[PDB]
Amino acid sequence: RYRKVVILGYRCVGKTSLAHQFVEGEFSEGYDPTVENTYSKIVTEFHLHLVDTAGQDEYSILPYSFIIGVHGYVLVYSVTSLHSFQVIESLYQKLHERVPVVLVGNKADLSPEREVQAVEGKKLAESWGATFMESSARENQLTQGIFTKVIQEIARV
Ligand SMILES: Nc1nc2c(ncn2[C@@H]2O[C@H](COP(=O)(O)OP(=O)(O)NP(=O)(O)O)[C@@H](O)[C@H]2O)c(=O)[nH]1
Ligand SMILES: [Mg+2]
């Protein structure tokens, strides 16, 4: 079963690091601004095509490539950046202007720097009818769950 999932978020929230942890089982402390990557993985039988997008902000205009043919979305913000959490709301609105959406507050490992509480992202997700979780691209355990969830959620809907 072929399925296309688009990862969206503000820049530097860890979109690429999430996708790379999930697919290659590695985390890099480096940084490379994404133009567009695609990561293919077989999740057990679904052929998952992850479209890892360029970071976006409150003014950006999302192209058709992000809306058409998309079976599901992973919307990522960073728990250490409220600005990124504010942008993910805009990005959602632009999106609705129905698919499974999993909302991910990433970089939960960086606890001392947290700005956005779990209960806060959970409520936002609830307001959309989306599933919510937190993660760290540094933990394979935490990262797998995001992507197995969005697939289970597509098989659901
Ligand atoms: N501690 C920690 N660092 C993270 C986490 N996720 C990403 N990072 C780090 O944060 C930086 C941003 O990661 P990146 O994956 O490039 O984010 P992005 O959303 O893909 N950026 P862009 O929109 O520019 O493509 C990187 O230097 C990476 O090492 C995480 O969960 N925890
Ligand atoms: Mg990226």
Curated annotation (Swiss-Prot):
- GO annotations of cellular component type: cytoplasm; endomembrane system; plasma membrane
Keyword match Iron-sulfur: no
What name does UniProt use for this protein?
A: GTPase RhebL1
Q: Name one GO molecular function term.
A: GTPase activity
- Keyword check for Cell membrane: no
What is an example of a Pfam family matching this protein? Ras
Q: Residues that bind GTP, according to the entry?
A: 12-17, 28-34, 55, 106-109, 136-137
Species in which this protein is naturally found: Homo sapiens (Human)
Q: What is the lineage of its organism?
A: Eukaryota, Metazoa, Chordata, Craniata, Vertebrata
Question: Which family does the UniProt entry place this protein in?
Answer: Belongs to the small GTPase superfamily. Rheb family.
Q: Can you tell me which residues bind Mg(2+)?
A: T34
Question: What keyword terms does UniProt attach to this protein?
Answer: Cytoplasm, GTP-binding, Hydrolase, Lipoprotein, Magnesium, Membrane, Metal-binding, Methylation, Nucleotide-binding, Prenylation
According to UniProt, the reaction catalysed is: GTP + H2O = GDP + phosphate + H(+)
EC number(s) on file: 3.6.5.-
| The protein's assembly and partners | Interacts with MTOR.
PANTHER family named among the record's database cross-references: RAS, DI-RAS, AND RHEB FAMILY MEMBERS OF SMALL GTPASE SUPERFAMILY (PTHR24070)
Membrane topology is: Lipid-anchor
Tissue specificity: Ubiquitously expressed. Expression increased at least 2-fold in several tumor cell lines.
- What does this gene product do? Binds GTP and exhibits intrinsic GTPase activity. May activate NF-kappa-B-mediated gene transcription. Promotes signal transduction through MTOR, activates RPS6KB1, and is a downstream target of the small GTPase-activating proteins TSC1 and TSC2.
